[PDB]
Amino acid sequence: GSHSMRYFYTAMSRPGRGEPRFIAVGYVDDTQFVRFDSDAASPRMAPRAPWIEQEGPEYWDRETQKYKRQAQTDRVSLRNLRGYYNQSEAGSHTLQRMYGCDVGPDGRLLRGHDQSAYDGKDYIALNEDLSSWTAADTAAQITQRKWEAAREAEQWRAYLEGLCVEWLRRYLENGKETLQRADPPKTHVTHHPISDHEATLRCWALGFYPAEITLTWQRDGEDQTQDTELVETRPAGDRTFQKWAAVVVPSGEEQRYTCHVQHEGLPKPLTLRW
C-alpha cells in the first residue's frame, strides 16, 4: 500500500583531469525510473522505466536543468569540503546525497528525508521535523550554520510536503500496472549432502518484486533463526529479485524441516519441504 520516491546523487572529484562527475538515479520503490550522468555522451539523462517515457518535453527539459544546476552546486560543495577538512587539492573525494518522500496507502506524506555523506561517512542530515539538521561532525557544523541562515530546511519542507508527494502519486498512477503489482516469488527447495551424515536444504525465491521478502526455516515448527544462512537479496537484472535461505540437517531428518516464504505478492505465506 505504501510507497516511496528516492533520489541518489553521487559527485566524484578528479582534480586536474576534469570537473567532478555528477551521477543521479531516481527510484519509485525498488524501480529505477531515471539516470543523469554528466559524463555520458548523448543523451545525459535517460529514462529507465516505460511509464516515465510517457512524460513530455517540458517535463524532461525541466529535470535536465535541475540536474545541470545540481552538478554545478556539487562542484562548489566538493571545493568547500576539501577546505573544511584541510585536505590536499590532489586527492579524489566523493559527495553523496539521498532524499525523497514516503507516503501511505492514502498517498499522504508519512515522512521526508534528505541526507548527505562525504567520503562514505554521514556528513549532514535533515531531521524528520524537516526544520533542523544533524551535523555528523565538527566540519558539518559549518554547513549547518550556512543552511540555517539560508533557511534551507524550509525549502526542503515545501518540496517534501508538496511536489515530492504530488509527483510520487502521479508516477504511481501512470506506472500502476507495474509499480502497484507485486510479483510473487517462484520457489523451490534443493538438497546438497555435505557428508553422509549432514545435508544442506536450500529454499529459493526467484523473480519477485518488490525486494522485501522473508525466508525462514523451521524444524517441527520451531524457527531456526540462529542456524539459518541467508544470502543477500540480489537483482536478477529484469527488475525482479532473488534470495535463498539454507539450513544444515542430519541426514534422514529432512522431513522435520519446512521453509516459509512471506512476500507482498503472496496473500498467504508458502510452506515448502524437501
Best CA proximity match to 85, nearest among 94, 74, 72: 94
Instruction: Give the binding-site size for Na ion (rule: CB under 5 A).
Output: 5
Judged by beta carbon, residue 40 or residue 163, the one nearer Na ion is 163
Judged by beta carbon, residue 49 or residue 201, the one nearer Na ion is 201
Cα–Cα distance, 208 to 119 (Å, whole number): 33
Answer yes or no whether residue 242 interacts with Na ion by CB under 5 A: no
Letter for the amino acid at 59? Y
Query: In the complex, what is the shortest distance from the CB of residue 272 to Na ion, in angstroms, rounded to a whole number?
Result: 8
Query: In the complex, what is the shortest distance from the CB of residue 187 to Na ion, in angstroms, rounded to a whole number?
Result: 4
> What are the DSSP E strand ranges found in 76-235?
94-103, 109-118, 121-126, 133-135, 186-193, 198-208, 214-219, 222-223, 229-230, 234-235
Answer yes or no whether residue 163 interacts with Na ion by CB under 5 A: yes
Stretch that binds Na ion, among 36-44, 118-126, 157-165, 239-247 (CB under 5 A): 157-165
Cα–Cα distance, 137 to 123 (Å, whole number): 7
C-alpha distances (whole Å) from 55 to each of 15, 60, 67, 146, 200 are 37, 7, 17, 36, 50
Cα–Cα distance, 233 to 166 (Å, whole number): 30
Q: Site for Na ion (CB under 5 A): which residue of 187, 216, 242, 258?
A: 187
Query: In the complex, what is the shortest distance from the CB of residue 157 to Na ion, in angstroms, rounded to a whole number?
Result: 9
Judged by beta carbon, residue 71 or residue 203, the one nearer Na ion is 203
Judged by beta carbon, residue 7 or residue 84, the one nearer Na ion is 7
Query: In the complex, what is the shortest distance from the CB of residue 185 to Na ion, in angstroms, rounded to a whole number?
Result: 6
User: Could you tell me the three cell numbers for 42?
Assistant: 548523448
Judged by beta carbon, residue 163 or residue 236, the one nearer Na ion is 163
Residue 142 DSSP SS3: helix
Stretch that binds Na ion, among 35-43, 138-146, 159-167, 240-248 (CB under 5 A): 159-167
Answer yes or no whether residue 162 interacts with Na ion by CB under 5 A: yes
Cα–Cα distance, 165 to 179 (Å, whole number): 16
Query: What is the chain's percent helix, strand, coil content, to nearest 5?
Result: 25, 40, 35
Cα–Cα distance, 99 to 8 (Å, whole number): 7
Element (H, E) at 46: strand 45-47
Stretch that binds Na ion, among 8-16, 113-121, 156-164, 221-229 (CB under 5 A): 156-164
Query: In the complex, what is the shortest distance from the CB of residue 23 to Na ion, in angstroms, rounded to a whole number?
Result: 25
Judged by beta carbon, residue 43 or residue 162, the one nearer Na ion is 162
Judged by beta carbon, residue 123 or residue 156, the one nearer Na ion is 156
Query: In the complex, what is the shortest distance from the CB of residue 121 to Na ion, in angstroms, rounded to a whole number?
Result: 30
Judged by beta carbon, residue 38 or residue 187, the one nearer Na ion is 187
Residues facing 198 on adjacent strands: 250
Query: In the complex, what is the shortest distance from the CB of residue 188 to Na ion, in angstroms, rounded to a whole number?
Result: 8
Query: In the complex, what is the shortest distance from the CB of residue 242 to Na ion, in angstroms, rounded to a whole number?
Result: 13
Interface with Na ion (CB under 5 A): 158-159, 162-163, 187
